[PDB]
Design a binder for this molecule. Structure first.
Ligand SMILES: O=C(O)C(=O)Cc1c[nH]c2ccccc12
Ligand SMILES: O=C(O)C(=O)Cc1c[nH]c2ccccc12
Ligand SMILES: [Fe+3]
Ligand SMILES: [Fe+3]
Lengths: 119, 111
């Protein structure tokens, strides 16, 4: 009686996001999780932001990964300051900070995941 | 700005970690894994953790990655995208059957 979730992703609305964001871990799974995890492969998102600047009441981590280092690059806007992230990278967005990301470069198999940390 | 770029962190279980419990003043999860196209590896070692572990299997397009999860004497064949909970104490491991470049399995230890 293993617990398996395959009805994925779970689309959930997130502030300032044009479309519901694709979640792979949500806070209610498996009796309750201390994180939520959303994101996707970036190869078709180059130049196309998924959201306008937005604020969360929880910390969010951007996790940028690609098969080979350097194959993915995003620009993170953090309270009006721009930061370039190169795969592999993890960036913490403190709760209350206005932020969003723009994909600069991405191969097939490049991902950015946003990990909401449950406080 | 808090950015970590010295990644992955090899830790003994050695697994490549992208989130460790000490990052950013303390995290409630740890996250390890890697892309699967080079793991498609004839064997894999059963092991147990003291915390729950979630397998998160993804590929650029749905269905492009496939693993076998062995959990306490039962074999499970999972197709991307999939998430599977491995309860703390349960003997387990996974084997990659099929994976396009850019497929990942992450093991997420839930504190
Ligand atoms: O895989 C795609 O095409 C996406 O929609 C990616 C995506 C949507 N919302 C996000 C929030 C954080 C990281 C990636 C995404
Ligand atoms: O050894 C490597 O290069 C790996 O990719 C290890 C790995 C891939 N997926 C995982 C999930 C949980 C623990 C280790 C791995
Ligand atoms: Fe955000
Ligand atoms: Fe494990």
């Amino acid at each position: 009686d293993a617990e398996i979730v395959t009805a994925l992703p779970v689309p959930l609305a997130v502030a300032g996001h044009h479309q519901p964001a694709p979640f792979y871990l949500t806070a209610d799974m498996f009796g309750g999780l201390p994180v939520q995890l959303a994101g996707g492969e970036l190869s078709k998102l180059v130049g196309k932001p998924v959201a306008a600047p937005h604020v969360h009441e929880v910390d969010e981590l951007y996790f940028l990964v690609s098969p080979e280092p350097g194959q993915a690059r995003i620009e993170v806007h953090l309270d009006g300051v721009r930061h370039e992230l190169v795969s592999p990278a993890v960036m913490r967005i403190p709760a209350g900070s206005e932020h969003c990301f723009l994909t600069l470069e991405a191969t097939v198999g490049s991902y950015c995941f946003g990990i909401l940390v449950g406080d």
